[PDB]
Amino acid sequence: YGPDQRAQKKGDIILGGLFPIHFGVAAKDQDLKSRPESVECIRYNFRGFRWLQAMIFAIEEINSSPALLPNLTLGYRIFDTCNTVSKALEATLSFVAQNKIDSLNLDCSEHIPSTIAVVGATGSGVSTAVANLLGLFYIPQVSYASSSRLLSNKNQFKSFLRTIPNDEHQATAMADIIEYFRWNWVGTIAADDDYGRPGIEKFREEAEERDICIDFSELISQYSDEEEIQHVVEVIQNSTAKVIVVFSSGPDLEPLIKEIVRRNITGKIWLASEAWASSSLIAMPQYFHVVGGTIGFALKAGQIPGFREFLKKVHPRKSVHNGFAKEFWEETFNCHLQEFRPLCTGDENISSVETPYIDYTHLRISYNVYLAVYSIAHALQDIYTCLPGRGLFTNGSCADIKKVEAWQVLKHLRHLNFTNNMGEQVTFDECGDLVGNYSIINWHLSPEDGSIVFKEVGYYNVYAKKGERLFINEEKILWSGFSREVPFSNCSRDCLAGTRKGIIEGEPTCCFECVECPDGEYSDETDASACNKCPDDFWSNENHTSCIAKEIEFLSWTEPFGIALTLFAVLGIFLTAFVLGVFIKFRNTPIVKATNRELSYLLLFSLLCCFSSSLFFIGEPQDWTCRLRQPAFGISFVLCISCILVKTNRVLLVFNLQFLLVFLCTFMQIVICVIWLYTAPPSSYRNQELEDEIIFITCHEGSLMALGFLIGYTCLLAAICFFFAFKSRKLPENFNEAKFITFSMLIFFIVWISFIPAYASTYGKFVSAVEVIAILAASFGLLACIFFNKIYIILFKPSRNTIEEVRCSTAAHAFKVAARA
Amino acid sequence: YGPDQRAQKKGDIILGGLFPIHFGVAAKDQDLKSRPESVECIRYNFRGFRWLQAMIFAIEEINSSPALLPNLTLGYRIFDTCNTVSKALEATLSFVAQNKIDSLNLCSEHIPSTIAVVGATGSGVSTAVANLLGLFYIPQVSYASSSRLLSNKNQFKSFLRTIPNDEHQATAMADIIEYFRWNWVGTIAADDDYGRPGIEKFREEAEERDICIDFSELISQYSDEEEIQHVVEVIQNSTAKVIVVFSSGPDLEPLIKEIVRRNITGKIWLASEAWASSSLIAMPQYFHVVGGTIGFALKAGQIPGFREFLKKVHPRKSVHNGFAKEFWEETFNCHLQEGFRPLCTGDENISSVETPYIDYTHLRISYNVYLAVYSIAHALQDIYTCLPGRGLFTNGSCADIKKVEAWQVLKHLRHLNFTNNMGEQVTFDECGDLVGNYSIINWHLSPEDGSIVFKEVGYYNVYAKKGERLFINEEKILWSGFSREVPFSNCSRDCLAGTRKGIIEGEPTCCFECVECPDGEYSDETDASACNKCPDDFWSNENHTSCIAKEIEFLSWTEPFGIALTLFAVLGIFLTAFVLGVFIKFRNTPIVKATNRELSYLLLFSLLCCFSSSLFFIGEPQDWTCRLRQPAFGISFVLCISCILVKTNRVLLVFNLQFLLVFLCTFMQIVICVIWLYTAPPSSYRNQELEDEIIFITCHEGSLMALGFLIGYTCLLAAICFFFAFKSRKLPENFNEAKFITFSMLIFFIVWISFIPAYASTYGKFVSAVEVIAILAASFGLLACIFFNKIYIILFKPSRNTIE
Ligand SMILES: *[C@@H]1O[C@H](CO)[C@@H](O[C@@H]2O[C@H](CO)[C@@H](O)[C@H](O)[C@H]2NC(C)=O)[C@H](O)[C@H]1NC(C)=O
Ligand SMILES: *[C@@H]1O[C@H](CO)[C@@H](O[C@@H]2O[C@H](CO)[C@@H](O)[C@H](O)[C@H]2NC(C)=O)[C@H](O)[C@H]1NC(C)=O
Ligand SMILES: *[C@@H]1O[C@H](CO)[C@@H](O[C@@H]2O[C@H](CO)[C@@H](O)[C@H](O)[C@H]2NC(C)=O)[C@H](O)[C@H]1NC(C)=O
Ligand SMILES: *[C@@H]1O[C@H](CO)[C@@H](O[C@@H]2O[C@H](CO)[C@@H](O)[C@H](O)[C@H]2NC(C)=O)[C@H](O)[C@H]1NC(C)=O
Ligand SMILES: *[C@@H]1O[C@H](CO)[C@@H](O[C@@H]2O[C@H](CO)[C@@H](O)[C@H](O)[C@H]2NC(C)=O)[C@H](O)[C@H]1NC(C)=O
Ligand SMILES: C[C@@H](N[C@H]1CCN(c2ccc(CC(=O)O)cc2)C1)c1cccc2ccccc12
Ligand SMILES: C[C@@H](N[C@H]1CCN(c2ccc(CC(=O)O)cc2)C1)c1cccc2ccccc12
Ligand SMILES: N[C@@H](Cc1c[nH]c2ccccc12)C(=O)O
Ligand SMILES: N[C@@H](Cc1c[nH]c2ccccc12)C(=O)O
Ligand SMILES: *[C@@H]1O[C@H](CO)[C@@H](O)[C@H](O)[C@H]1NC(C)=O
Ligand SMILES: *[C@@H]1O[C@H](CO)[C@@H](O)[C@H](O)[C@H]1NC(C)=O
Ligand SMILES: *[C@@H]1O[C@H](CO)[C@@H](O)[C@H](O)[C@H]1NC(C)=O
Ligand SMILES: *[C@@H]1O[C@H](CO)[C@@H](O)[C@H](O)[C@H]1NC(C)=O
Ligand SMILES: *[C@@H]1O[C@H](CO)[C@@H](O)[C@H](O)[C@H]1NC(C)=O
Ligand SMILES: [Ca+2]
Ligand SMILES: [Ca+2]
Ligand SMILES: [Ca+2]
Ligand SMILES: [Ca+2]
């Protein structure tokens, strides 16, 4: 009773089966103008038939063993679901036919069989729908393929168990693979069912913690219409993201792949979930230029030893218990069995045709089917061997094996721990789950046959700690089926050393602009968020990748200018010392004795101090040299001017008594200098505001009226000396001294007046060189005006140094005779 | 047959119904050490019993009316689901017991046949019931299930609903958040088929409008202590104040109880429709946490005899309602004697106890139940009045009302269009849905008894054009129950003008810092992502809000410096004209023909030209003053130098010829200036790179070689005349003028060497000043020591003293 096409065999204990022998149903959703009929399954699935044969082979192998359930046989009733909720519910209503009559008091045939457990429901929505109806009657349901996390809820799904791991490790592993290859710009596609939606939600939650930006997220279906598919295609080809993560199955993904292949969209990196990473619907050679280089997940393979020889024994006339063998024979050989295609014989050979039935290389879901059947058999064997007094039920009492009920088998399945043929331990946890490792594979092209080869490139170990679970061998991956270069999948290129990041408005964090830093700031590492302002006495490059030290500007002792000015100063000091020496040697003579013999000594000492006071303007301006820069020249030159002015002419008649005048004339300068240095002294000053890349060192004078008073006092005494010596230029005594005094005063005023435009233009820039040159020029002019004339008669023409020449000049000059050479 | 507690009446045509009379089932763990019993239902639900009474009132009203299905009765079988999939699945297997026997080909043979089911409340229960009812094409009309996943007609073939689905609601929450200008919110969903698509649609709509979501959590009714503690810790670690909740009342009650136990105040709760009017959550003792909630409600309908029917209920007079006895026990808190808690009597008054049964303002879900029943009956009436030859079936054939089948009822339900008691039109679309408006409520506190009052503060109009659907009256909102101020729920504070948003690493784009703008760039808006560049002739102000105009710089008139230079030039022109006038006055005295008096006229005219040539430097250069700046002074000063050098000693004997030897040395310079002006003319220039804040206006010379030749010829002529006047400085003829020529050339060379460091140092306004001052000083010195001694001799010294 129930569906017609089935696999059935009698026994003492009956198991139920649910497998997708067809991929789907015929699209015939029309109005109800006639009474509705049964739908028609459309596309044959050879892999599902192999799964059904795995369950049949496991049952036969259990029934031949004397060590597992002796003297009682197992039977089966297996139906087709066609990947559809409605066919599975039609089969499940016949699974619970005995139990439902008792609950509804409906009463009658009294010869209907009871199933104790159900193996089946590949797809997760089909699994949830079957689990809802089976959990009413506490019938256990072991699934070989459904991996949704929503079926781990034991409040709603009381009797559901799995031989496959659930999909949360897979989503975490997908995030880990994206993190390993250093991408941050991806798109996601999931199937709109109970399988794709929670997996892609877990992947989104994991990708948010690892700073991965997701651009698009779309949903697809097997029964999607055309305009939805073109909306998804325009969403895909409007993005610059290359990596697409797909959580779907084969028949749910086929129309989108067909539309993408038709439009020739190339260069995408597909990350596949386990449900389509080995599908024969997607892995076609004609699709390769779109789907080459896919990276995907696989489960761990197992060995069922005599299974291939069992698969090679199928026949339509010999399989009396398998009602699916006839259509399998017709779809393999494209023929028709009697009772337009030609008539089948039974002589045809399975090895001649290439379908996924016997052309596989690893058993993964088939091993899960085998493990499910053996789990149920080991729970039954635990029932059979249990000793009175040590059971799992009330008082420690044992179930009866000849009247066994389904809830007792479910209770024994919750406490199961057995060893399989691989020598590993199979137990289920509190949520009914079962952990396992993952293999990581990559799609290649076969050079010989042209088909698609699945190459193992890594693994995911679930028993390691978080962060150390992934292994990938990068050298074995071909990236679009041909290339050895890891692709670029970021939103924007990396900012370089001279730049920083900038926000683009309305766009996520992974997309940024690269902005040049300003003239004062730098950056050194790659993806900077801000330019660091490096501290004082530093400035950036022209390229802003670092910053370098500023340049300190001042006049030092090692410049050529400094050596030249030092040589001129030392030569002046040597010449003045030479003149003092010849005055000391050739004394007691009328030329020296006529020049008062004591004012000349102090005049030469003043000239020595005025020459040596120009050395404070060269070097680094410190706090104390800036205090003695200006007063040193200010007192030395006024001492020299007073020594010149005291000796000239009848001004001494206006009132030794000569020295007191010099004493007052330099003591006034001494007191104004000491009150200036005690009220507000000058000090050094590091100027950075004039030019950006150069620190000047200059001197701030403090007060300004004190400096004006100093220069005014010196110019006042110079003008008084010039005026009083300007009257007396016609007296031809002492070798015409007053003419040279007026010449020296004129030289002083001309130099310090003509140096005015040089002083105001380059103010703040090395003006101390100008201040050295003016001092040296004035000192040289005064010394050469006063002493060299008398030196020429004293040294090179003696016996003219006589009293008769001082009182009456004999008209012979030094400079004309020296210029005559 | 089936479940024991039921409501049941007989009839010709039988409808089915599913309502939650209890809030859930007893939380017990099955160790499976004995055979499992049936689970027990707990926490009576008075609103659900009112919902069940709506269906019976509708069916009795239809049965008493002669204008709708005459001579034909309706019956019912109604069961309790307890918000659970398994109880509803037992009830649904009781519904389909006739149809399933024929499909399996599998005793009583008098089994009644259900032709339609009034649906469930929650979407998981509706999906599980619809999966089984679609196998037999039995129509199912739900009054409350609003999930989008039930709009898929490939999976759910026979499902209809009188409630709008949740996509408009999830768009409306994002519209509310956009209206109050928030960008930093959190979400909480219930882990079922109701909360997950609602929060997914909200997340997509909020990412469309630049709203950043901080956290996202799932809750349930059966969450334990550690999950609730984790969710409360996730809430308490976040600065987001606005929280959007998509859940029902039973699924949200444990989280709310734990938040109340910790006194977490200050959050802004945004309520979906399932818990926005829930008595489990809207309690006075929770008002310090969930006060001021803004939520959604459906539109209210009117059923004009329904309250009287609700008050006619009785445990011993309702013989078709099995749910009345437990209602009566739970209302009056007693025990009913069958056929401490006191013994109930039959004489109690329903108005004495405040339960949600007759304590309501508006009928919203009850009106949906009423519409579901009337939709089914109007489909049956459309069957009953079909005319032969115009049916909906094959060849235009009509179904038979005495032998009706459920697929024909579903076919007529897909083509239904009728008018209701409120005067609106009821049709279902191709996905089986029905749109409707929303009302927006705010949770206040009553000053009378302390209960929670729902106040209407706006609407959402789904018939309007997108972007114009929301209306909010803000003056009626009390935030947190007491405050009249809109709260702040942004991640970061705003950056003002003169600042730029800077990135914080590892954080979303709604969180940023503020960095000041650079010197040459400006930003006037707030929350500016970058500084904008000022234009070419503009610079930014002191806080970089707007560009101000760049200052221009040149030596100008009405400046004090330019006025002083102009007064000195006018004074020089005046005294040179005085000297010329005195010389033309005494043109017939011996001391004037002592020199060549025709040459001194040319010398004084060239001195006038040399004074007048200095006025071209002052003012703004206008691209023709730059052409006449340098050649005018060049030719005037070489005319002065040649006029001096002709009259010196022993050059005129070398060679009337004086004017020719003037003409050659001025014609050479005229040739140089005219070649320079014809080949590469000077041009004006606006210099901007010297200061980057001021624009200097200068003259680009155009050629340096020609300017070098122009200077060098003048220097050469000055050197030759200096040498030829230096050889004969001791001669006393012409009042010792050779030493004065020597002094004039010495002054010229001293000034033009003294002003050379002022050309390599300063660059702006102050260079034209020194070009005026050097010209003035050189020409003043030349004129002074050439024509002052003779002027003293003629004028101030007596003319009787040595004029012969
Ligand atoms: C993909 O991008 C294209 C290119 O911009 C979009 O096409 C344009 O869309 C705008 C928006 O209304 C229209 O004004 C233009 O007329 C469209 N141009 C063309 C050539 O169609 C397109 O809408 C985008 N699609 C998706 C799904 O985002
Ligand atoms: C693409 O973007 C990622 C994410 O920012 C970059 O990965 C960073 O690379 C730098 C340099 O190697 C590391 O210091 C960071 O730790 C990486 N971040 C993360 C989260 O792993 C990646 O370098 C970018 N790729 C390209 C080609 O620009
Ligand atoms: C919180 O952030 C939002 C941005 O998401 C701000 O809204 C902007 O406000 C400015 C000025 O008030 C408007 O010019 C923009 O058009 C608004 N943008 C949007 C998208 O609405 C909001 O002002 C911020 N709130 C506070 C208190 O700073
Ligand atoms: C919420 O914030 C608290 C406060 O930091 C976190 O508690 C600390 O977590 C760190 C890291 O796990 C521990 O080292 C500390 O001992 C914790 N306690 C304290 C008092 O600092 C808590 O982990 C956060 N929770 C969530 C869900 O974010
Ligand atoms: C949904 O709400 C809108 C606005 O609340 C209703 O439109 C109003 O209809 C009345 C009468 O038809 C008019 O007087 C108002 O001017 C309308 N307002 C606006 C803003 O258009 C609309 O009728 C409601 N729809 C339903 C089905 O009740
Ligand atoms: C070395 C100099 N110091 C600096 C300070 C400003 N400066 C300066 C330059 C030119 C003039 C025009 C003028 O009056 O001829 C006036 C001043 C030069 C100095 C120090 C002390 C006394 C001085 C006495 C007389 C001249 C120089 C003096
Ligand atoms: C008034 C003077 N003007 C000349 C003097 C120096 N000057 C100048 C201008 C620009 C640069 C290059 C730069 O800075 O880009 C260099 C020099 C401009 C003048 C005019 C004509 C003949 C003269 C004969 C003798 C002395 C002066 C003469
Ligand atoms: N995990 C899938 C089922 C599945 C696993 N592997 C497969 C291979 C082929 C087809 C389906 C599958 C689901 O729950 O829906
Ligand atoms: N829409 C809710 C059901 C619902 C609507 N309004 C309600 C009021 C109270 C309880 C439940 C509801 C769901 O699908 O789950
Ligand atoms: C299963 O059995 C093995 C040995 O019999 C034991 O080591 C292991 O812990 C058991 N597993 C569980 C989950 O009890
Ligand atoms: C999982 O993978 C790791 C690493 O390859 C391996 O050591 C471990 O044994 C595997 N686990 C199982 C159960 O096979
Ligand atoms: C900038 O220029 C310098 C030398 O000109 C060079 O060494 C440096 O690498 C450059 N920086 C960048 C980021 O190109
Ligand atoms: C329903 O009937 C009314 C009355 O004629 C009509 O205006 C309206 O368009 C109809 N609606 C549909 C969906 O046919
Ligand atoms: C700029 O800032 C100053 C003080 O910091 C203030 O006086 C002035 O008004 C500001 N200008 C603008 C345009 O805000
Ligand atoms: Ca056996
Ligand atoms: Ca955006
Ligand atoms: Ca009637
Ligand atoms: Ca983050």
Curated annotation (Swiss-Prot), chain A:
Effect caused by changing residue 99 to K: In HYPOC1; the mutation shifts the concentration-response curve to the left and increases maximal activity
Source species: Homo sapiens (Human)
Impact after mutating residue 736 to I: In HYPOC1; increased G-protein coupled receptor signaling pathway
Positions of the UniProt region annotated as Intracellular loop 3 (ICL3): 724-739
Effect of mutating residue 50 to E: Abolishes G-protein coupled receptor signaling pathway
Protein's recorded name: Extracellular calcium-sensing receptor
Marked site (Important for ability of agonist AMG 416 to activate G-protein-coupled receptor activity) residue numbers: 431
Effect of residue 103 to C: In HYPOC1; increased G-protein coupled receptor signaling pathway
